[PDB]
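Subject: complex prediction, re-run

Hi both,

The earlier run crashed halfway through, so I resubmitted it with identical inputs.
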Amino acid sequence: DNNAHVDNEFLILQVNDAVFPIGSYTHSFGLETYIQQKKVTNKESALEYLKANLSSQFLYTEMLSLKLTYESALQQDLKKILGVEEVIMLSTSPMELRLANQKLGNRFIKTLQAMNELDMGEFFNAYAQKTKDPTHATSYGVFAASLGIELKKALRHYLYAQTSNMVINCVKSVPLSQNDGQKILLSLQSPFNQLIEKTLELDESHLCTA
Amino acid sequence: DNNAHVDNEFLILQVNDAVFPIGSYTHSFGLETYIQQKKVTNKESALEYLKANLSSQFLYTEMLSLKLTYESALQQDLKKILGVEEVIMLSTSPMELRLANQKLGNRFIKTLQAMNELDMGEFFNAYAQKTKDPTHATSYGVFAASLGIELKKALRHYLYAQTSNMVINCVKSVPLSQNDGQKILLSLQSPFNQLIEKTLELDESHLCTA
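This time it finished cleanly. Structure:
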């Protein structure tokens, strides 16, 4: 195998690392308002905001989209993958967020491709050639499936990385102490498991329904 | 169990996250010289410097110390843990690096302890009460053993986090392109596995022998 020298246990850490050079996650977009309006003011209200957000659009769009493209990639169904990306593109507002999401997806793909010693396989190659509105979550789904990374593991690492980013945004913006940030992340571990279990129960009919 | 709500699969990500608030890793200390002297000038020479460093003091002090305190914690042998920390303290130069390492170890312990909803167990509590010269690796070893995290997994996450930090330091300092940084990390995956296998073969008689 061309990937004999590749260890997915490290590669999954690598692509979820904050330094993986694809630009910043976009979760910060709809947070500034909550802070200005005195909605999020402390650890308690930050946690409630995070739990609500994680279980709404983050779940029914981002996490679910990852699961859907992962599953479709295993079936080698590019048409369904492009279909999922189309639904997301047509559902995302405002335009600035859509553009930021598309930029992030494109950068994720390009960053993988720049690692010439990593063979993503023909299906991924074709996905990269055809995608019009990639997102980080959908492209990551195809990536994980392509390399044979288990779905639940792929979801756990992605979920943690996204949520770490969300929490640090609250830490910096509210602001909160660093200790409060760590308490929040610890408090989110049970909800994380509930989110993954729920994600596995959903399907295309639930996509973008939050 | 007091830790019913804790999921080690997320907690291991949390404590290895660059945002875990303990201050910067100290690997950058002995790098500035290599760059000034035109020793590390590109991707190729950065990789060789990293491979050499990973297989020398990083292996025989840092990785091995983690393994040793993990093993001793399973045996509930605090005396041996303090013994390992003593050897490291007495072997580390210069004084500024020693102080930085001690500060990092102390911060790791304190950061864990500030998460009141995490029960580290009596052995860890006693370790925290008695440690004089903690380091990140030794305290992490006791932490991982205390929570029942498998040793090879604990080592993989720690190794990746440390090396990501080392690579980004080269990226910024040489400087290198971000793409070169990712190629280096990918190239290190086989060496990573060799390092972990070697770490498992070593014992107290090898500590600080590089």
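The radius of gyration of chain B is 17 Å.

- K.
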